[PDB]
Amino acid sequence: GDDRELAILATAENLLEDRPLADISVDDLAKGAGISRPTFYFYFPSKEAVLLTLLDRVVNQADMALQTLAENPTDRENMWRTGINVFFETFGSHKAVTRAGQAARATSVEVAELWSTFMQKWIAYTAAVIDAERDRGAAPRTLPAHELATALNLMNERTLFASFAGEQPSVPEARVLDTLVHIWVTSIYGE
Amino acid sequence: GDDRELAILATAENLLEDRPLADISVDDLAKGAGISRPTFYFYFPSKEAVLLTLLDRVVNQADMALQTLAENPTDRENMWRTGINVFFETFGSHKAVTRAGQAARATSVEVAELWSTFMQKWIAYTAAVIDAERDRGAAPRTLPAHELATALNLMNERTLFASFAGEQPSVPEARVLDTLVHIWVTSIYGE
Ligand SMILES: Cc1nc(-c2ccc(S(=O)(=O)NCCC(F)(F)F)cc2)cs1
Ligand SMILES: Cc1nc(-c2ccc(S(=O)(=O)NCCC(F)(F)F)cc2)cs1
Numbered sequence: 001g002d003d004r005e006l007a008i009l010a011t012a013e014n015l016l017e018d019r020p021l022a023d024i025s026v027d028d029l030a031k032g033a034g035i036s037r038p039t040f041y042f043y044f045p046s047k048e049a050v051l052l053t054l055l056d057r058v059v060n061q062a063d064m065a066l067q068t069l070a071e072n073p074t075d076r077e078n079m080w081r082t083g084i085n086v087f088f089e090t091f092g093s094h095k096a097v098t099r100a101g102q103a104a105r106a107t108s109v110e111v112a113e114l115w116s117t118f119m120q121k122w123i124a125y126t127a128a129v130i131d132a133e134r135d136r137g138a139a140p141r142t143l144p145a146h147e148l149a150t151a152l153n154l155m156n157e158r159t160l161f162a163s164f165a166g167e168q169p170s171v172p173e174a175r176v177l178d179t180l181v182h183i184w185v186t187s188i189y190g191e
Numbered sequence: 192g193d194d195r196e197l198a199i200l201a202t203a204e205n206l207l208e209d210r211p212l213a214d215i216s217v218d219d220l221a222k223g224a225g226i227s228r229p230t231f232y233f234y235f236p237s238k239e240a241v242l243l244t245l246l247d248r249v250v251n252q253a254d255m256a257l258q259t260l261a262e263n264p265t266d267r268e269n270m271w272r273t274g275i276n277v278f279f280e281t282f283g284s285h286k287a288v289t290r291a292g293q294a295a296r297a298t299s300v301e302v303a304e305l306w307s308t309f310m311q312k313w314i315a316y317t318a319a320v321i322d323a324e325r326d327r328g329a330a331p332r333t334l335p336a337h338e339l340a341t342a343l344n345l346m347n348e349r350t351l352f353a354s355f356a357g358e359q360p361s362v363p364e365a366r367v368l369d370t371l372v373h374i375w376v377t378s379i380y381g382e
Binding site: 103119120123143144151152153154157159162167168169178180182183186189191 | 294297307310311314333334335338339341342343344345346348349350353358359360361362363366369370371373374377378380381382
């Protein structure tokens with residue numbers, strides 16, 4: 001059962017579409033995966049270790065997609081658009097996992113640190129590119145890169161997830177990407 | 192005891208500096224306010240009704256401060272700076288209440304709706320001013336005002352509270368205001 005592990009993971013993702021993690025139990029994941037509950041414990045310490053793995057696969061997948069863009073070099077607006085779209089698509093394709101993993105930041109120290117580690121990495125990378133662009137004479141030296149990048153990344157976290165969750169207020173899903181790209185391009189190039 | 196009510200409210204604010212709401216009990220608020228626990232229930236249904244009132248006073252105070260600016264009319268960068276500073280100062284002066292009321296959005300429907308109501312109001316107001324400025328020929332017609340205003344407000348929510356809570360990553364408290372003002376001015380006036 002690496003089969004059975006993937007089965008447990010797919011079952012968690014499906015059930016998370018319909019209800020929160022506190023509304024799902026181990027017996028539910030077990031049943032769904034076609035195995036007994038003690039068999040479940042061979043794979044995962046708990047429900048929450050399931051969410052953590054689901055979350056970790058989605059963030060790593062966003063992160064790899066971001067590496068892929070990085071290694072293969074278009075106008076500046078589009079470059080930023082393609083980077084942001086990595087997150088809109090990756091998380092937009094896994095809304096139940098995104099939403100539930102963001103809620104679990106409050107109550108799980110491993111979820112909080114997983115998210116926190118990848119944010120620092122995403123911010124460091126955004127700043128490196130901002131700085132690169134300043135090195136080339138294409139963007140002006142205004143805010144420190146690393147502070148500008150931190151506010152931009154935290155914006156996208158809040159706005160993407162608000163859109164995906166249908167929160168009031170939020171930008172409509174169909175408008176969210178253009179909205180973010182406009183703010184990134186004007187703040188990075190203006191000033 | 193409107194005295195006793197204010198005493199209960201001050202005691203909650205002080206204890207929230209040192210620990211979370213789940214670490215505070217009614218007997219703690221009672222004791223702190225110099226009254227018995229059944230006397231506490233005359234004032235508040237629960238601990239959480241206390242947080243809700245504390246939160247509601249801070250948001251209304253931010254909101255009034257924002258009305259005050261509105262009724263008395265300086266350059267555009269500074270106008271935005273003064274608006275954002277209302278939030279940085281108001282919430283910055285009540286960090287324990289801010290932080291705990293943001294955590295309570297997850298688990299309390301009244302806290303969620305209080306926050307949600309004032310966000311719609313803050314966004315509607317930001318858009319009205321963006322649109323005004325477009326009417327005068329001072330800002331270009333780029334994004335729809337109301338979508339640009341929504342992403343900007345959600346940015347400030349996430350970034351201010353991350354700074355106040357010392358989160359990793361976050362912008363340093365001493366840099367957060369300039370960081371936000373730069374992004375607001377370039378995105379509203381650029382493109
Ligand atoms: C072309 C480039 N894009 C990025 C880039 C980095 C991070 C983000 S993000 O803000 O949207 N990711 C962090 C917030 C999240 F993950 F919640 F979306 C967008 C583009 C770096 S270089
Ligand atoms: C000069 C003007 N400023 C505003 C203004 C409205 C809202 C905000 S906010 O984004 O910082 N408030 C909402 C987010 C919060 F409350 F969490 F800070 C800042 C300025 C409207 S007109």
